[PDB]
Amino acid sequence: STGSATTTPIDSLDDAYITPVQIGTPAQTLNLDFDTGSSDLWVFSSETTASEVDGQTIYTPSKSTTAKLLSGATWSISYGDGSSSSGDVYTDTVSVGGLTVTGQAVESAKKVSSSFTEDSTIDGLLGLAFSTLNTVSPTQQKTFFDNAKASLDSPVFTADLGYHAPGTYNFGFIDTTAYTGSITYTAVSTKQGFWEWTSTGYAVGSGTFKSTSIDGIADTGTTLLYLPATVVSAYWAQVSGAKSSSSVGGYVFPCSATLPSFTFGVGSARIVIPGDYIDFGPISTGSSSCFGGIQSSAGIGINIFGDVALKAAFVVFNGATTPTLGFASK
């Protein structure tokens, strides 16, 4: 089997992407944030505290003839941005782009933190990291991809995120028309539960490539590119007037600037992020100070190849017995 679904930016900045997902019988379609940095499929629901729902579409398990309470199971998750959610668990039929999994754990939120409530466009998350990170207790549950894998034509999914435009998540096949050149594959460590890999270096604009190992994670659920402070300083030093602002929370730059590109290495291959992809717009409405899309990871503990980086590539998440990642230009 295969599946193919369009993923759409939630706003004009590409802050996140939503993909329609069919849950239950008859189908209830929710728009979920596919997140290769986490491993829970959780949804706003008829069980979510009413004051914490503000425009999201909810899953109502009592209206699904295939829903079953997973007795005794609870979940609770906290994300790198400080947001969180928790609740109980049903199993139900879940379909993405024509690919159907029966008995998928659907984690129904009883509580969500304010940032989720405040974002009416995201109805939940669909985790695509390794199932070892799934938070369901006392019996950890598998991700949608883990449950689908054996049925897929090939045990892979691909992320093709758009810049200011829709893109595609495919399951079970590699669309050879969706990228240019060849796909360069690179090793993955699953020791932390992430799609963790090592970039071979970077360049700023037209500058020389610096060969240096940068361990980080491929994370579709993180907006920005978070890299070591040395790398980030070298980038922003090429933007007149850019500075790190402790009050704003990162590097800012004059909105009148033209940003240089940023290149990262994948083996001997190179992925070029155009400068425009690094512009996240005014820090507040009407400001001429703009927020940068490349930020320091120094306070995180891990480097993160988020959407800024991934949307410059066609990315293969290869879930074979020894997982690997592939990157192609597009």
Short description:
The chain has helices at residues 114-117, 144-148, 229-236, 307-310; strands at residues 3-9, 17-23, 28-35, 41-43, 68-78, 84-96, 99-112, 124-127, 156-160, 167-171, 184-187, 196-204, 210-218, 225-227, 243-245, 250-254, 262-266, 269-273, 279-282, 289-292, 294-296, 303-305, 314-318, 324-328. By secondary structure, the chain is mainly beta.
Q: Describe it for me?
A:
The protein has 2 domains: 5-174, Acid Proteases (Cathepsin D, subunit A, domain 1), CATH 2.40.70; 175-330, Cathepsin D, subunit A, domain 1. The strands form 3 sheets. It has a 7-stranded mixed beta sheet. A 6-stranded mixed β-barrel has the order 2-3-8-4-7-6. A hairpin with a 7-residue loop joins β1 and β2. The radius of gyration is 20 Å and the shape is globular. It is mostly beta strands. The chain contains 4 helices and 24 strands. It has helices at residues 114-117, 144-148, 229-236, 307-310; strands spanning 3-9, 17-23, 28-35, 41-43, 68-78, 84-96, 99-112, 124-127, 156-160, 167-171, 184-187, 196-204, 210-218, 225-227, 243-245, 250-254, 262-266, 269-273, 279-282, 289-292, 294-296, 303-305, 314-318, 324-328. Belongs to the peptidase A1 family. One of its GO terms (molecular function) is aspartic-type endopeptidase activity. It is an enzyme of class 3 (hydrolase). The active site is at 35, 199.
